[PDB]
Amino acid sequence: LAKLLRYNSTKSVDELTSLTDYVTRMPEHQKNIYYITGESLKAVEKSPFLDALKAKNFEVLFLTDPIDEYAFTQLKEFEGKTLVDITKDFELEETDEEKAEREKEIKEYEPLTKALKEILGDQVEKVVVSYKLLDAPAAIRTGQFGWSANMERIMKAQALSYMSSKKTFEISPKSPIIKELKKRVDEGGAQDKTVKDLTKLLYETALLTSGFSLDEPTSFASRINRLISLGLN
Amino acid sequence: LAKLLRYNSTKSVDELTSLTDYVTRMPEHQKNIYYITGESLKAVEKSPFLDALKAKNFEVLFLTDPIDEYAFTQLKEFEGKTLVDITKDFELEETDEEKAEREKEIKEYEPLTKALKEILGDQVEKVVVSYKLLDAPAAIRTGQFGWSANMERIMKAQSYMSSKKTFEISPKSPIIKELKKRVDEGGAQDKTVKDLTKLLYETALLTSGFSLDEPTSFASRINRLISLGLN
């Protein structure tokens, strides 16, 4: 059942592997089994959620078939807890030193997160600075109660109504785009029009990057065209 | 999450009700929250799985939308466990009274259940006599930990290893009672037996939301039967 042998992984592309094989390759200090859910191999392969995991030498399983997606949610553990990393996880508290050094950096960034919460409005449950996010300015994490992008995808054809999920807008503090927005926001930029349009544009990019799709793409498109037209005089 | 108010039920047709409403209507001796999934309200309304629950004064929620079905399987509990009864459930420890009266009967049906397993072959994981089934000769129960019949349908539209289906027979049906006689009279591979159980199993499939393997086999089986009423 769990020796099924039917998934690719960050530590095993081309050749298939089972869950029970994954567990042997786990380093001693890996507490969890990490996987990702998506439509296709090509989609998840380049997800910005992997980068934080790869940096810690942790393996991530690839589940393209929705049957596998449910299976893990009913099981929940093997010896360590299985979990989607599209949803909210806490990586092995990479040293207690950082967990203090962060609270400092997180503090001066809530004015930004506050402003972004206003600009984004109801479309997200939270706006948060995330350190699980590298090589990307922003991404969107499903809440620990909700819909993986892949699930939302399959249920969308058979619904819209009965709501959706509380999505969380993560921003990476090591990204130049976010670093600039903190400057503009900390210098009375919160309600400038160029800022607002771009964070909105930024947010929609995070959606596509994170597997979701846009509501009314024309609004987004016109945001794009506006921006590529800035360089035209 | 659970107060949404978006379901009909055996104790509430016409008017919509929430999970928290259900939980207050439960008698003190109900341990579980019972619901059922199906294509449409009209379809599930007459499911043969409901009869056993109503006879025990248990309310059953109606989940026709797969979104709602997904939610309950992710929720998994409220205080008592939510559960599909299309899948395999264990009825609230019926009583120490029955746990003996049945064990006798299951034995006297071991010739049939064994025989029926042979005619059906790999299509089912088990064949078992069931008392959760009244006013029907046979039905097909998805195994637990798995995908409800309705769910499998939606994901195919959007080897295969589907699910472990179980073929339940009611020892309380005349049709089943006859098969016990014939099988206890050297009937296991009698031809009338084989055709009838297969006829039942395919019906059990359709009644339970699944679709047929080789619909022609069923059809000619059907007409074969209706052609007996002219000779």
Residue numbers in the entry:
A (entry chain B): 439 to 598, 605 to 677
B (entry chain A): 439 to 596, 605 to 677
The authors write:
The structure of a complex between LA1011 and a Hsp90 fragment (residues 438–677) was solved with molecular replacement and refined to an anisotropic resolution limit of 2.94 A (isotropic 3.18 Å). The structure revealed two dimer molecules of the Hsp90 fragment in the asymmetric unit, but only one of the dimers contained bound LA1011. Superimposition of the LA1011-bound Hsp90 dimer with the apo-dimer revealed that the unoccupied site is restricted (especially by the side chain of Leu 674) and requires movement of a helix (Pro 661 to Leu 676) to form an open site able to accept LA1011. However, LA1011 was found to bind in a small hydrophobic pocket at the extreme C-terminus of the dimer interface of Hsp90. However, one of the methyl ester groups of LA1011 bound across the two-fold symmetry point of the Hsp90 dimer, and hence, only a single molecule of LA1011 was able to bind to the Hsp90 dimer. The binding pocket was lined by a series of hydrophobic and hydrophilic amino acid residues, but there were no obvious hydrophilic interactions. The pocket was lined by the amino acids Leu 671, Ile 672, Leu 674, Gly 675 and Leu 676 from one molecule of the dimer and by Glu 624, Leu 625, Arg 628, Thr 638, Asp 641, Leu 642, Leu 671 and Leu 674 from the other protomer. The structure presented herein showed that LA1011 binds to the opposite end of the C-terminal domain of Hsp90 in relation to the site suggested using molecular dynamics. However, this does not escape the fact that it is clear that LA1011 directly competes with FKBP51 for binding to the extreme C-terminal hydrophobic pocket of Hsp90. It appears that the trifluoromethyl phenyl group of LA1011, to some degree, mimics a key binding residue of FKBP51 (Phe 413), PP5 (Phe 148) and AIP (Phe 324), such that future development of LA1011 would need to focus on this key interaction.
Heat shock protein 90 (Hsp90) is a molecular chaperone that together with its co-chaperones is responsible for the activation of an eclectic set of client proteins. These clients represent key signalling proteins, which when dysregulated lead to disease, including cancer and neurodegeneration. Hsp90 forms macromolecular complexes with co-chaperones that can regulate tau metabolism and Aβ processing. Recently, the dihydropyridine LA1011 was shown to reduce tau pathology and amyloid plaque formation in transgenic AD mice, probably through its interaction with Hsp90, although the precise mode of action is currently unknown.
